[PDB]
Design a protein around this ligand. Structure first.
Ligand SMILES: CC(C)(C)c1cc(O)ccc1O
Ligand SMILES: [Cl-]
Length: 115
């Protein structure tokens, strides 16, 4: 079901090394629905190339636009398992501190704060 499940550490590592070569200005982000989630829909895809200059505030807006939400639907974004300390931080900086050993940046979303 989940991304880590579907691809070997070996495969995930090699895809990250390719995105480096072919999309050097992009952050490799895995974005996944919380396995509990009742309200929000699933995304068309799992793996996104996010421009390295957008802050987390713009990445939340992007994904809310991808899910086509409206003003009073709720959306929470976890990064590498925990809450974001700050939405104002650039995704280049967030990558360097929050990346996985495979080289992706893992994110999970829900309508509840209690995942
Ligand atoms: C081919 C390319 C490196 C651009 C790529 C894009 C993507 O969304 C997922 C995997 C990839 O290797
Ligand atoms: Cl690029």
């Amino acid at each position: 079901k989940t991304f880590k499940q579907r691809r070997t550490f070996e495969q995930r590592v090699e895809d990250v090394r390719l995105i480096r070569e072919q999309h050097p200005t992009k952050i490799p982000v895995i974005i996944e629905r919380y396995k509990g989630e009742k309200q929000l829909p699933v995304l068309d895809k799992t793996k996104f190339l996010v421009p390295d200059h957008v802050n987390m505030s713009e990445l939340i807006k992007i994904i809310r636009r991808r899910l086509q939400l409206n003003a009073n639907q709720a959306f929470f974004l976890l990064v590498n398992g925990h809450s974001m300390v700050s939405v104002s931080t650039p995704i280049s900086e967030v990558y360097e501190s929050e990346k996985d050993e495979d080289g992706f940046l893992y994110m999970v979303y829900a309508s509840q704060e209690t995942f």
